[PDB]
Amino acid sequence: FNKVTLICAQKFNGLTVLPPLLTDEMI
Amino acid sequence: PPAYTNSFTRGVYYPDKVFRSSVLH
Amino acid sequence: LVKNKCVNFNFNGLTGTGVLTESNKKFLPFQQFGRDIADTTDAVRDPQTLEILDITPCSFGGVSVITPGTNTSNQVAVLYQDVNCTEV
Amino acid sequence: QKLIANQFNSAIGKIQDSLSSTASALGKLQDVVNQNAQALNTLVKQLS
Amino acid sequence: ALHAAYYVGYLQPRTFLLKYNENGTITDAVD
Ligand SMILES: *[C@@H]1O[C@H](CO)[C@@H](O)[C@H](O)[C@H]1NC(C)=O
Ligand SMILES: *[C@@H]1O[C@H](CO)[C@@H](O)[C@H](O)[C@H]1NC(C)=O
Ligand SMILES: *[C@@H]1O[C@H](CO)[C@@H](O)[C@H](O)[C@H]1NC(C)=O
Known part of the structure; x- marks a missing residue:
């Protein structure tokens, strides 16, 4: 969960x- | 006689008044 | 100026519609807007008194209607997706 | 049995390291997450 | 003021890749 990765930026x-x-x- | 020289990186300027952050634009 | 409350607005001819809040977004002395990766107006600075207002879209959300099959009940429970329960 | 346990216990360990020291193991997962987001921004920019 | 170097460039329609920083100051660029 760290090695992988704004959420409302495209909302x-x-x-x-x-x-x-x-x-x-x-x- | 004009004595040239090497601009290097100078001459960048905020192209607008917009603000941004951490964003390659 | 109103805060924390969905309003239409215009600033300095910049317009848009949002929820203007108080934001630590340190704008540059000559910088007017903010913006964002998506290229969507975000922070602004109040032209009169100089301060960093966020913006924020209004709400959206779908409206989902939970139902046990009408064969069972007529009672439905709406679900407003992705809001905080006030604006209802 | 003893040996195998070690081989296995050891073997586990390296995974942490394989994962810790490397961002290129998870490329797949890491990619999907891009292409989506990648495809949103595009979708958004189209607004402009 | 007559009783000291200076320079001149000329601007061109390049396209750069800026990089803003957190505070919003351009900290780098790439032509
Ligand atoms: C649902 O109600 C219908 C009549 O509306 C009936 O035909 C059916 O048997 C009911 N379903 C069940 C599982 O009993
Ligand atoms: C929801 O709204 C209340 C205001 O009634 C606010 O205090 C709270 O922080 C909000 N929480 C979430 C998760 O939206
Ligand atoms: C912004 O300026 C403040 C001034 O002290 C400094 O603490 C901070 O590190 C700076 N950050 C950037 C990205 O320039």
Whole structure:
């Protein structure tokens, strides 16, 4: 989780990002 | 006679009044 | 000037519509706007009194309608995606 | 058995290092995450 | 002021890659 990588930066125009059903805690 | 020389990197200037950060633009 | 509250605005002919808040974004003395990776106006500085206001889109969100099949109930539970529960 | 355990215990270890000292193991994952985001920005810029 | 070097360039339509910094000051550029 460190070796991999703003979220709302591309959310300016209706481009939303629905959260995944499974949460990185469940996974 | 004009004596040339090597500009190196000088001569950059804020092209606008916009602010940015950490952003190669 | 109003804060923390969705407003239309114009600053100095810069317009847009947002939620103007208080922001530590240290703007440059001659710098007017801010901007952002996506090239979308972000911070501004109040022309009269010089200070760094954020901006922020309004809300969006979808509206999802949770339902047990109408065969069971008529009762639905709306879900407003991706907002903080006020603007409802 | 003893030997194998060590071989295996050791073997685990290197992974940490393979992962710690290198950003190029996860390229795949790391990529997907780009291409998406990569493709958003494009989508956005189109607004302008 | 007559009883000291100076220079002249000329600007050209180059395209640069700036790099702003956190404070917002251009800390580098690439032609
Ligand atoms: C759902 O209700 C319908 C009538 O609206 C009925 O035909 C059906 O049997 C019901 N479903 C179940 C699982 O009982
Ligand atoms: C939600 O809104 C309240 C204001 O009623 C605010 O105090 C809180 O920080 C917000 N939290 C989130 C997660 O949006
Ligand atoms: C911005 O300026 C402040 C002034 O002290 C300094 O602390 C900070 O490191 C600077 N950051 C950058 C990116 O210039």
